[PDB]
Amino acid sequence: RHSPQEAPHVQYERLGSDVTLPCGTANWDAAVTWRVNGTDLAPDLLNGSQLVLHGLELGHSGLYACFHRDSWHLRHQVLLHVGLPPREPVLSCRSNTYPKGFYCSWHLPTPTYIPNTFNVTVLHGSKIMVCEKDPALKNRCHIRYMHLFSTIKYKVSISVSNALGHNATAITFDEFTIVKPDPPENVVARPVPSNPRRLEVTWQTPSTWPDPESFPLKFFLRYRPLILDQWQHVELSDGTAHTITDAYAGKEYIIQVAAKDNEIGTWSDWSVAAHATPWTEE
Amino acid sequence: EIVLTQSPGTLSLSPGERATLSCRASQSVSSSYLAWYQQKPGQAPRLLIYGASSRATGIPDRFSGSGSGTDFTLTISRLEPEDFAVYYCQQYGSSPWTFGQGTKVEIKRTVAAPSVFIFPPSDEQLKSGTASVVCLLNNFYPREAKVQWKVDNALQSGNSQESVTEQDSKDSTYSLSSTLTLSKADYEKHKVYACEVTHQGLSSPVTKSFNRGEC
Amino acid sequence: DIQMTQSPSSLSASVGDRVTITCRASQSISSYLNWYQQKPGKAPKLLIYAASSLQSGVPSRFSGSGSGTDFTLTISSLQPEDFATYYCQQSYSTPPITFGQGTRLEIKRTVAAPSVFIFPPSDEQLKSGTASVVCLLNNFYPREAKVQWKVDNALQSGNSQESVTEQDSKDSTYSLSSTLTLSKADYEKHKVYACEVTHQGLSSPVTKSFNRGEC
Amino acid sequence: QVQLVESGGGVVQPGRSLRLSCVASGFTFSTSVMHWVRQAPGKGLEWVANIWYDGINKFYVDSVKGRFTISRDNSKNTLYLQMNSLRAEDTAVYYCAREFWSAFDLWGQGTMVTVSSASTKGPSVFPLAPCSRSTSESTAALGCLVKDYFPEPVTVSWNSGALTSGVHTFPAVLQSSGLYSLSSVVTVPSSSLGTKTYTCNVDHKPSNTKVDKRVES
Amino acid sequence: QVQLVESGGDVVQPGRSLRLSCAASGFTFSYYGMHWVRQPPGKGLEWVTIISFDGSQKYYADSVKGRFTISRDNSKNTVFLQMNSLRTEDTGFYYCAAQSSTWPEYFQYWGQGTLVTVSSASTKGPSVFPLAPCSTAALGCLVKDYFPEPVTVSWNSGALTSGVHTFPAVLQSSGLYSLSSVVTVPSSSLGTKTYTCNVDHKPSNTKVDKRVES
Ligand SMILES: *[C@@H]1O[C@H](CO)[C@@H](O[C@@H]2O[C@H](CO)[C@@H](O)[C@H](O)[C@H]2NC(C)=O)[C@H](O)[C@H]1NC(C)=O
Ligand SMILES: *[C@@H]1O[C@H](CO)[C@@H](O[C@@H]2O[C@H](CO)[C@@H](O)[C@H](O)[C@H]2NC(C)=O)[C@H](O)[C@H]1NC(C)=O
Ligand SMILES: *[C@@H]1O[C@H](CO)[C@@H](O[C@@H]2O[C@H](CO)[C@@H](O)[C@H](O)[C@H]2NC(C)=O)[C@H](O)[C@H]1NC(C)=O
Ligand SMILES: *[C@@H]1O[C@H](CO)[C@@H](O[C@@H]2O[C@H](CO)[C@@H](O)[C@H](O)[C@H]2NC(C)=O)[C@H](O)[C@H]1NC(C)=O
């Protein structure tokens, strides 16, 4: 190779493959020894002056250096990395804010040990989109809406490549099936001294929704004791308040609620928790 | 590797009719990554529909596609004089970029009887050391036709080449050129040379022959 | 990348003397240096590899020392069969392999005076269109010499080519020849031609002139 | 407007090397994926190589692995393709793509690459005429034959371009001798063979050969 | 016993490409790597390219990158060098060498080399002109406008060799070379002793004799 003062090269190989590592432009009948991480190898894996590796695994990656026989004079260096070809990515778009834009996440099912390159292209019919990204994460560009009730479906495609292969995937959807708000926060329960079988339950709206007045939501309330394991399902109308009348006398409870728009979207995840027992007269 | 099979090989239709093409794969196409192309004789391919259901920028509204998984069909509303070309399909998602065999669309007309002519080798080529006998076919239709060579009632095989031209612009006919290549030592040994051509527009095969040494 | 610098580019010394050749590099190289010997009209021959290891079949008078950035090629006793050009090659960075500019060794002798002569153009040179008058230098030493071309004490520049010979095998002298190329117009416009040489062994420049129409 | 221009292809011998170039214009070359698609004479398309926008990831087909090398330059908006150790099955017309939706959106005009040891030779013309002399049907046929020429193409004209009705020039065929061959025929009435003269003009620019033949009964 | 021969070098215009051939013998050709070093006339050596012992690693210099291509066949022991887009500055003697197997590496074997002249000027015939003055005198004849080298100059059918100084060829700007030969004999000879030079040229088929006398 080049001068021994150089940095080692980067060479990627497959898992279970076979590859030979020569000592640069040296001859075949030259005295050459190899060392991995400072440990010398056995002469059984040397085909003259080259290094022959059979059955590459995850433990064969590292710094392979070429030295003179029984010496510390460096000749050639190379960094070997073992990885797998990429698989079909898992693309999923979600509209956390219906009046505003949406976002799309993607990830590989089987992890790879080498860096990857991703490129996403979003189409609204025959037009082009930019999807300027502003997240704290990556692998998202947050496509922003421009028209409403356009009846035209969106097309998103993400392509991934590697030093050993490449792959791509694409999905299609509308502007209504990807709508899913965030669960409400600070769901607190309070006792009621006025009634024996009562519990004050009040929640809020998700902070991500910028325009809730023009697009109301429907809440699904679930209240259940801690020992019966029999959950109850009660769907509510417009409002962030409820009143239960058939709860326990003294035992604890867990109440969780979700959110969903009036005509579009899907049901959201449940809230964190709730714990309160009704008042006891003594 | 996924093999793309198109059917049929050649589609003969008149301008103003509906032309539906097909391109069947070996496995299911992932994410509907199928494209259609159009290539004219002597030009570059032209992308028509990407994703098997989305037209490209500038492509007319008469082109339309559909399909799911393995069986995809390309349907044209009505044919135009500039719509007769070769179309291909592209597969991606489960293998590297591969193309199909191709489908040729030609103009349909009435059957025509060929006018067969035969030409003996010239004296210059004979004195050089080779003898080529050419049998000419002119203004025939359709393309399906074969020519039989007979050298003194002996069928010849493996020593003949055929060349055909494209469709004409006015009458939309064909013309084929079959040649029999023999050396000087093989030409003067025989006496007669015949060219028998059969065709759909002919009741019985026509035979054109000449005798060596009298012309 | 690595640039090799030799010092000096030419050395003159007699036989039996100690000659030292220096080769300088652009960076720090441990021992990756090779010394070659190339004679006029033959391929180069390796003398010392690793700058300190003599090759088999090389006399013991050759030696090499130095490391890091500066090296040294020394000869104990100079022999008549040792006058040749020497190069130093680095084997640290590949590609590229860089060589030195070369160091040619010459024979040492006393300073001698040249014998200068001029030759007017011939009669066959007149009817062509150009006239070339040459000025000869013969048996001078050292090679460093400068000649003058003046037509009626007029200085010329860029209109003359000169070439020097190698060292003679008997007394190791030099010979140089310079040709003045001028067409017939400028040749017939002037009449007097001169050539004066400047040399170390000459107290005053030797004058050998002629005029047109007199010869 | 957007366009792709290819250059750097020509006739070469087996075992030599070539280098193609694809210059882009009208679009952002630094933010697009480039491809190479070839097409053999009388066959379908075939993908050859692929390179991304940055230029580190490169892909090739199993038929050209170890012999071809793709490269690009984002500053000059060009696309190179180093072809080494060319064989007989490498004769095709290469193109360049853009891969908008994995569909090869843009294409170039192409470049023909011929890899053979045909030992370039000038063409030869032989007259073709029916040896029988029959005036039964009022229409006859004549022509001139061209054989043993290399490379393509060859333009054939009749009467110095004064005759174009009824001329049928057949495409060139690749014989086993490594040289091409074609033929030209003209359909003229039978009475026009005794007074009017019919000459075919054959030219070959790679060899600078112009040979015309007097073809008549 | 190790022999290295080269072939494929002569005058070629800068518009055509050339290919060199290097056949090795006397050692295991498959175990050694072959080098290529060129040397222009009147200058030092210059490395060009390097190929591995098997044929996987190939490196070229920036001066000939993109135009040269090196290959080798271990079965027939022949080295190839496809030189494309030649130019006049590429003129010089190319040498076929092989690296060493020890440490550090060096050039162990060398060949006789071949000459590759690249100039647009084609073959031309030489024209001679006598040179005579107008003690000890000097006589000679001038040779100009010839291509290519070499040219044999003798005097009196080779019977006179003392005092003859033939100058090397000078590449003029016209694409042709020129040289001269001077003979110095005592001044008591110009009355009876007449001298003539013999110029020979094999490629251009030229043999010219000229009687030099004033
Ligand atoms: C070292 O590598 C060489 C090259 O692959 C091996 O030589 C091959 O050996 C096999 C079986 O003996 C032959 O079929 C091949 O033709 C040989 N190739 C060449 C180029 O000679 C050699 O056997 C290897 N040696 C060891 C100890 O592994
Ligand atoms: C040589 O040393 C390197 C550096 O520690 C090793 O690379 C690490 O290997 C471990 C074990 O798989 C991983 O958990 C680390 O993430 C690796 N580090 C990096 C930076 O990649 C390598 O495995 C060693 N090789 C051998 C043969 O011992
Ligand atoms: C993209 O990823 C898919 C999914 O892994 C690959 O499809 C697999 O390909 C392998 C090898 O051809 C087969 O053994 C599997 O059965 C395939 N699985 C499925 C679900 O199709 C596909 O080959 C990848 N594409 C590229 C270009 O690497
Ligand atoms: C593929 O991805 C790269 C990187 O994300 C894109 O390059 C970006 O292009 C935009 C607009 O042209 C620039 O503002 C960025 O600065 C670029 N980033 C980098 C790292 O260069 C490229 O445009 C994508 N290509 C396609 C077809 O989507």
Residue numbers in the entry:
A (entry chain C): 24 to 305
B (entry chain G), C (entry chain E): 1 to 215
D (entry chain F): 1 to 217
E (entry chain D): 1 to 134, 141 to 220
From the paper:
These cytokines share a canonical four-helix bundle structure in which four major helices (termed helices A to D) are linked by three loops (termed AB, BC, and CD loops), as well as three conserved receptor binding epitopes (termed sites 1 to 3). IL-6 and IL-11 signal through gp130 homodimerization, while other cytokines require another “tall” signaling receptor, such as LIF receptor (LIFR) or IL-27 receptor subunit alpha (IL-27Rα), which forms a heterodimer with gp130 for signal transduction.
The CNTFRα D1 model derived from this structure was also fitted into the 3.37-Å CNTF signaling complex map as a rigid body. No dramatic conformational changes of CNTFRα and IL-6Rα were observed upon ligand binding.
